[model samples]
Target chain A: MNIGLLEALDQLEEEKGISKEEVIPILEKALVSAYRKNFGNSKNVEVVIDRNTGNIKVYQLLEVVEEVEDPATQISLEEAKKIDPLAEVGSIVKKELNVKNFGRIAAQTAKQVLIQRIRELEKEKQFEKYSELKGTVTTAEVIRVMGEWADIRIGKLETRLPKKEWIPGEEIKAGDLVKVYIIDVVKTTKGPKILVSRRVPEFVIGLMKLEIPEVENGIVEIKAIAREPGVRTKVAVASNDPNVDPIGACIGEGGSRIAAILKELKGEKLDVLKWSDDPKQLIANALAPATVIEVEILDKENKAARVLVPPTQLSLAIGKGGQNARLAAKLTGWKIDIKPIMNL
Target chain B: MNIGLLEALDQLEEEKGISKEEVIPILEKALVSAYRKNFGNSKNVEVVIDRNTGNIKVYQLLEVVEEVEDPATQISLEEAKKIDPLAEVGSIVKKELNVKNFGRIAAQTAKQVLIQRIRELEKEKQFEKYSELKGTVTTAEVIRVMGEWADIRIGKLETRLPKKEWIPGEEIKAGDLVKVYIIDVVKTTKGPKILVSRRVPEFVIGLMKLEIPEVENGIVEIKAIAREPGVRTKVAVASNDPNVDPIGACIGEGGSRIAAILKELKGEKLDVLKWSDDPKQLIANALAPATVIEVEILDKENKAARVLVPPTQLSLAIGKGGQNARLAAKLTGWKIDIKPIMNL
Candidate 1:
């Protein structure tokens, strides 16, 4: 009689990925709930399932007593002995019951539980799949722009890229591919949240590692980096081998490699400076594009320095809004004060 | 004025997440292709989209020459001079051309490129999101069981859990949750492939780290682990503080913590042993569950030891299939020979 139900289990196992072993528990739980709902919870009931045959059985327990007050709760020892030969007082007897077309409500309950379980399973899996990218750089695409925020798609999921992480003065449009640094992945009460950024100095270094072969292979190492996002950045580079010029290697011929890196930066100026050990030479190299005539260490302990440049180069050395000087100071860890040499 | 087109662009931006800036390039490229198809590609042509007005204009480029031999490719100086007053020989002139309807094929071309770019963007994003778990353990749900293999879901994605990674003598059913260690995520021609397993020794350690608070907080440390999937595992544990019992902490009160960890292991036996620095003491502890009369060191240089056990405990020390002895040897990194002391 239960062969049809068994066939349905087989069908579910093949088509729906639910096996007979798993379905049996679902049916058992559902049957117990159904027995309670339709028949009322007056009697102690239990549900059992046959593993091989997919048979469902319902049993009602009645306690065996010398004198029965209520027939449902208590049974005469004589009646219990008929069901089981060794019936004794205070012993329970299981009376088999037949369930035809177990209530539809029970089926619905089982379905709900299975669906909820699968959903929780997927959430955990998704969290694992995405949390792997924490502390690395990956590319994402701008799918929608709303107000100051952009909805970026990474793989199949979408997340908000806020304006604070966007490069200043840069405009984002749909279909634009941008590189983002994953700051961290945190599990909150709601779900796992992925933190990403585009304006960090590491984003610049990450782009260099991705774009330039020399930096990636360790032939040219990025010693330090300082950035004023969407404006300018200074990168200190050094080479392990004497044959390789770190700056030239980073800049590429006619600025080919650096151009590819800068194209992603949204017109930010990148200065690749040579790394040096001497404080005077390092300070002079850090402030480039404007000729530094001499550097005097004012307070070596405080890392304070005075840089002398031609009078005509003062404005260029200071740059627009003092950004260039500030970035050079950050890159070299020096407090630099610029003074101009007046014409004699 | 292309107001209808501008309105369509705005609608695209709002509804389809495609902005005017991105759409303009798509249209220009499509229109240029359309011009080649319609006009037979005989003349050099350019398509320009007006930034503000959303107007599109097509122009044919003809070189100004002394004499026009090929009228399609060459322009007369008089005509070139009329377009630009300072037109000189060998200079190219842009003659405006009128276009009607812009061809349905061009619209189709733009639509195809847009779809392709979005898909590529999604693939790259998906790769970044999943590759983060290259060296971690995550829970996945079994959705389908097919013969010896299972199709497991993590997040919204599904991957095959091969039979080789499954624990021996274990049965996997749908709706079962299992922890898998991600070995490596590789990007092949078919896209990113995530490798996961449950049989590795590290999987056990990974589970302990996730389940045990003491181990996770560094109060108790796992000194070494040796595993035989579906049979037994020996975990050597040590405590950072004297107050904490490492083995008991890992096993929990009444075996509560280890019980929870073992529940996922499909009846596999786990032995938590106290870690020791002394080779003699470590060897005796490693061969557990059997009363060791004495452990005699044979060759200290080769880490060889002879263990004397009670006659009745010899079989128990070796265990079923010699798995206990082998695991003990692996755990202590020593060669051991077990002998029974027969009441001499």
Candidate 2:
């Protein structure tokens, strides 16, 4: 191995994950063009780079013509035969150029091409990273704070948390690690702008994937999720395998799993409930930490449901400013109205 | 070798360009954490993965104590003695955990973490790619044209040519290769916004560097560049080494070098002039392709200069509507006036 070349490739691979093998063809093509530019012609010149060692050579391709008209492009049959014993008329021969024959011009052109190639590689590297994470969640380390917007380093991506996507009432200080949901990836002339969110409902689901294995495994499918971001969230799940308990799996032993997920989002009340195909049952489930004595289909055609609870549980069922009823309606895809059991 | 694990790693390495060897440590750490979550307890467990074969083993870190207080956290001296003849009270003992002891849950956690890790790796890959090319020039292939704006692929990056940055009267079509100057790189929710321009003077400088040997070699320094994009450009150059003529080198042999750069800009007139420390010499040189008899400094404080040319060349020296004189003034950082020479 060429120690310098090997070291450069290793550094790139470890830092940017661009394999040395992937860059061989890129390097070869660039060398060929630079060879032509530096040597003064492109006609019969060929550049070869060793597959693994990064060694390179420049060769002149010559046609075995009857008589040589141009020494740069053709070789006499006798001369071709001297170089290659099997040389035949109309066949071609590759004559190696003495590596020492390269002048300052060639070296300069090669160096110039190398610098441009490096710029291109670095550009492609950043785009590839943004493209892959088009709609994914990743952890970001806060670099600085600008009002509601925070500049962050997510993996190797530098992105900003726009004011609209900021977590409500959250202070983003420098060096704070925050989990963000990638909302979109746009190619901008200034650079790549990674639009991320800590407010989107998708962020909640992403946290669910990170915190709970059952969700990732498809053993527990999150059928419905409704949230007032940074305030409260209602997640409805169902077990695909009969043995797996969906709510229990998400909550873990004494809410360890949900507690672990809460650490990422900070202050949010997370309610885990069993999902049901029955609209009445789902509505009632979404309304809990509220007790419902009965769930009635108010209007089947309109997809509306009504829940009846004990007089003591009426306020609990309606929740703070009727957040429970509103979220229950969204989660179950039905309008929900809570009534006291005595009145119902 | 675990063919399944090896194949899975190979697929990622090929598809995502992530190295399997580098992922070994990442896999080990995730497995150890997930093992604690799924199988329960983190006091003594350790996970090891064979670097080459993708084989895994789990062990328990047991403290060699006089008496065993907890079987999970400590190993009895007697039992430790059987495992290791030189078992001591202070030294920790690594007891092998049966490979078959882990249930499906432990495997599931490892699998989830492994999958999540791949997504993170790909995310990191693209971020690094974009991060490196934040502000640079790269060749772009026009993928589509929408009136004034063009969608371009810069290597693997997708960026748009805004109406304000497009070349004048240039018909950009699909499959056309264009060089773009990245003005800035901004993180957008959609992706990377590569603020690119073909109209910037720096874009011309970038192209000049690519095609000219002297410029790339640092022998030719671009003293100043002034442009009315797509119309004309005035470049002032100087040589670092006294032996090299910066202006002559930029024009190259028979205007060969500037021709390549001009091809990229299409219809722009390029004026390569020698830069000088003397204001009068510098002002006269900046109005190249137009001859002047003598140049006089009008006011040193105000940076004003006067040029006298033959009567026949006076109009040409000033140019049509003073375009040449205006560009000369900008290039030399001096206000200039042109007048007809009269012999007494």
User: What C-alpha lDDT do the candidate models reach, one value each?
Assistant: 0.78, 0.75
lDDT of 1 by residue, B188-218 (tens): 5555556788888888888898888999889
Docking class of 1: incorrect
User: In order, what are the TM-scores of chain A for the candidates?
Assistant: 0.72, 0.67
lDDT of 2 by residue, A109-202 (tens): 3344445556656545434433557556788899998985889986656888876787677677999888899888776655566789988888
- CAPRI grade, predicted model 2: incorrect
Write the residue-wise lDDT of candidate 2 on B212-309 in tens digits: 88887899998998998888999988899999888788888998888888888888888888877556677878887688899887865557778999
In candidate 1, the residue pairs with backbone N, CA or C atoms under 3 Å apart (3 or more residues apart, or in different chains) clash, namely: A125-B154, A125-B155, A126-B155, A132-B132, A132-B133, A133-B132, A155-B125, A155-B126
Tell me the spans in candidate 1 whose CA falls farther than 4 Å from its real position.
Answer: A1-131, A143-151, A156-158, A173-176, A188-191, B1-344
Give the per-residue lDDT of model 1 (tens digit) for A140-214: 999988877899987755678888898888889899998888877666555555677889888898888887889
Model 2 CA deviation exceeding 4 Å by range: A1-113, A125-131, B1-344
The Cα RMSD in angstroms, rounded to one decimal, for candidate 1 relative to the true structure is 32.4
